[PDB]
Structure formats: C-alpha cells, structure tokens
Amino acid sequence: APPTLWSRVTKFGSGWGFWVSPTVFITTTHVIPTSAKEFFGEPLTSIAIHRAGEFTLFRFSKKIRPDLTGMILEEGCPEGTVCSVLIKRDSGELLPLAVRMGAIASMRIQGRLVHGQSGMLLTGANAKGMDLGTIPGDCGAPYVYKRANDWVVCGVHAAATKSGNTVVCAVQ
Amino acid sequence: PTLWSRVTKFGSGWGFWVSPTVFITTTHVIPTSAKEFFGEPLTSIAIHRAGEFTLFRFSKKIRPDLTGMILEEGCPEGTVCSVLIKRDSGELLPLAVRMGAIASMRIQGRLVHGQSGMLLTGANAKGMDLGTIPGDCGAPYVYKRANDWVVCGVHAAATKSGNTVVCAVQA
Numbered sequence A: 001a002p003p004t005l006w007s008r009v010t011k012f013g014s015g016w017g018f019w020v021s022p023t024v025f026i027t028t029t030h031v032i033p034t035s036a037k038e039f040f041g042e043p044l045t046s047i048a049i050h051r052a053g054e055f056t057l058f059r060f061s062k063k064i065r066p067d068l069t070g071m072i073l074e075e076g077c078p079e080g081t082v083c084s085v086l087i088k089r090d091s092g093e094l095l096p097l098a099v100r101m102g103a104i105a106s107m108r109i110q111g112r113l114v115h116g117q118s119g120m121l122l123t124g125a126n127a128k129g130m131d132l133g134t135i136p137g138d139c140g141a142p143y144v145y146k147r148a149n150d151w152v153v154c155g156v157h158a159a160a161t162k163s164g165n166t167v168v169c170a171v172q
Numbered sequence B: 001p002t003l004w005s006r007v008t009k010f011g012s013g014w015g016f017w018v019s020p021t022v023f024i025t026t027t028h029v030i031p032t033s034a035k036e037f038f039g040e041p042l043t044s045i046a047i048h049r050a051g052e053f054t055l056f057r058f059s060k061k062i063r064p065d066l067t068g069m070i071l072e073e074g075c076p077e078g079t080v081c082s083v084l085i086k087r088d089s090g091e092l093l094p095l096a097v098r099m100g101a102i103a104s105m106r107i108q109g110r111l112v113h114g115q116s117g118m119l120l121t122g123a124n125a126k127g128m129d130l131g132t133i134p135g136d137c138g139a140p141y142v143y144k145r146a147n148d149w150v151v152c153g154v155h156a157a158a159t160k161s162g163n164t165v166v167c168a169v170q171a
C-alpha cells in the first residue's frame, strides 16, 4: 500500500484515525478519549464533529496536515470488493490485512450492539489473535482499496468476532 | 513472542526458524559463495536438501529466544495455509492459500515439484498487496491445528497470473 496512505494513519486514544485531507480526520467513536476538550492544539469550539454510531469525522477550521492532498471517502464499498485494513504493529511493522467485504449488518459482538459493513479476512483460517487477525488496539484503522488509477477510503475498523473470521467497518 | 520474528532475510529471499538450531529455506535463494551463515562456519552446519526445500541444523543455539515448532511434510489436501510474506518496506502480508496435491508443474518455463496451492485473494493483486513476487521465495507455509502452529514448507514458485503457487516440502 502506498507510503502516502500509511502517513495518514495516526495513533489516537485507544486506537487509530485517518487523515482524509489537511482538515478532515476520521476514527472509530469508542477509541476517542471521553473527557477530551482539545485536539491537535485546537479547542472543541473550533472543530465540527459529525457522529454516526461508531463512525466519527472531525473537520478542523485550520490545516493540521498541510503535507496532505484531499482523497475520496465513500460510504462503504460494493459487495465483493477486496479491501486492505492499514494496521500498524509494535516496531514499524505494517500489516495491510486483506478482507472481502459483504453487506451492511447489525450484529452483537462481545455483548455490544454493532452496525456497519461486514467482511471476512483473507489471511488464514481460525485467524484469532495478532499474527493473522485483528486485536482491540486496531480499532480506527482505515479500510482502503484501489480503483482504475486511484485509492479510496470507505470506513474505519470497529469490531471483530471471537473466531476472528468476521470484521465490521463503521461507515459514513 | 511472534511467528513473524522467525521470518528472516536470507540470500535472494527469506527463511524461517523452526527452533533455536533449525532454519528452513528455498534451495534456489541460498548463496553459492559462502564460508559462514549467521556467524557460524559452514564446516559446523548440517545441510539437508530435497529439491527446492533445504534445512540447516546449526551446532550452537542461534535463536535461543524461540521454542521448537511442529514441522511436517506438506499438509492434508484442502487445508487453508497462510504464506507469511515479509517485504523490504516493513510490510507483513499473510495470504490465505487452499492447498492441493503434490505435483510437478511448469511455472514460466521451469519444472517445479512440491505441494500445489491456489491463492484465495481473487482476481489479480490489481496493484494491491494480494499476491506474491519473485523476492518472496523462502517464506513459510503455516496453519493453526488445535492449539499448535504447524509449518509445512517454503514458497518455491508462482505462476505469471499469480493464483497457482508451489510450497516445497521435506523428504
């Protein structure tokens, strides 16, 4: 996956978020620090926060990441799309986990009620644990894929079943 | 403690530490000019070759931080393995493969013997991280069985199209 996409993935609360543009940051609602009143030097008064269930978008009034070009963010992807989840792991290791995407779903995972785009990992069978699957520290990592000539972001990592086989992407 | 720490850059590809003293690789990535590997003189290294599978047994513990793993001669037909691909970017690419029969296959002009497999990542890579490249040879094939990780060979070859692969196996 291109270096410019890895540079957009930034450590945030109990997980990660993703710079779509110099002013727009997306992440998974549950990884956000609950009491926080300031982000990237800016007060909450100066930021437009758009919440839809487990998807949160931050739009800043100033350019926080002026090194970046704005890219395409879509509301999920077509059934059958193969995406990469851009997961960073202890020590500059980069894990772009392959996932075949399925339908928008409502599920109960570890007793929590979760709504988003379901998918199934293409890394291995019985992908429970950190070598072939997701861990709770991965929440907020972006779901991306390549079209004709450009890359698209279509959601952020929200949940995984106990078996590890099913993941859920929260969507705009 | 990770499987990934056992995957090691070696000659023109990779290899995998089965135990503190045992390292496995693809025969064609091994240097043809050498007096030592991993600081141990070749004189003290046991080399066991069966076609495109090579095993080294060292007389000293090179990787004393590791426990010994189960090594087998391929796996049952239909097993879904993962090929543990490392890239010089720092990317780790675990790719699912449905394992088939032991076969001889002409892969871009060359005859290669080993366990056939079909990548489960579909279409092509389409310039995504979904297939192998030549520099991936020696990467291990593994799967989880009960609570045990099993390693059943090393990445020997891939078709131009990408979707058929050959895993070289012991004996």
Ligand SMILES: COC(=O)c1ccc2ncccc2c1
Binding pocket: B078, B080, B098, B118, B119, B120
């Ligand atoms: C054990 O997995 C299957 O039954 C299966 C499923 C999908 C496949 N797709 C391509 C090639 C082979 C495949 C095999």
